[PDB]
Structure 1
Amino acid sequence: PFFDVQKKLGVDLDHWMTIQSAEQPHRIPARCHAFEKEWIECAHGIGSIRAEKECKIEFEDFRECLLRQKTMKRLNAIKRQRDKLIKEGKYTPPPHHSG
Structure 2
Amino acid sequence: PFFDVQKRLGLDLDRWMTIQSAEQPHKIPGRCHAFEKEWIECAHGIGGIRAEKECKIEFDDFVECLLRQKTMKRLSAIKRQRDKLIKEGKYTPPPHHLGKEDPRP
Q: Does TM-score exceed 0.5, indicating one fold?
A: yes
2-structure distance, mates of 1:82, 1:91: 7
Higher helix share: 2
Return 5+ residue gaps in structure 2 as ranges.
none
- The residue aligned with 1:52 is 52
- The residue aligned with 1:71 is 71
Return 5+ residue gaps in structure 1 as ranges.
none
- The residue aligned with 1:92 is 92
- Greater mean alpha carbon deviation, residues 37-46 or residues 7-16: 7-16
Which amino acid is 2:2 matched to? F
2-structure distance, mates of 1:50, 1:11: 28
Alpha-carbon RMSD across the aligned residues, in angstroms, is 1.4
What percentage of aligned pairs have identical amino acids?
A: 86
| Count of equivalent residues | 99
Higher RCO (CA-CA < 8 Å; seq separation 6+): 1
* Paired residue secondary structure (1:35): helix
Which amino acid is 1:42 matched to? C
2-structure distance, mates of 1:74, 1:19: 29
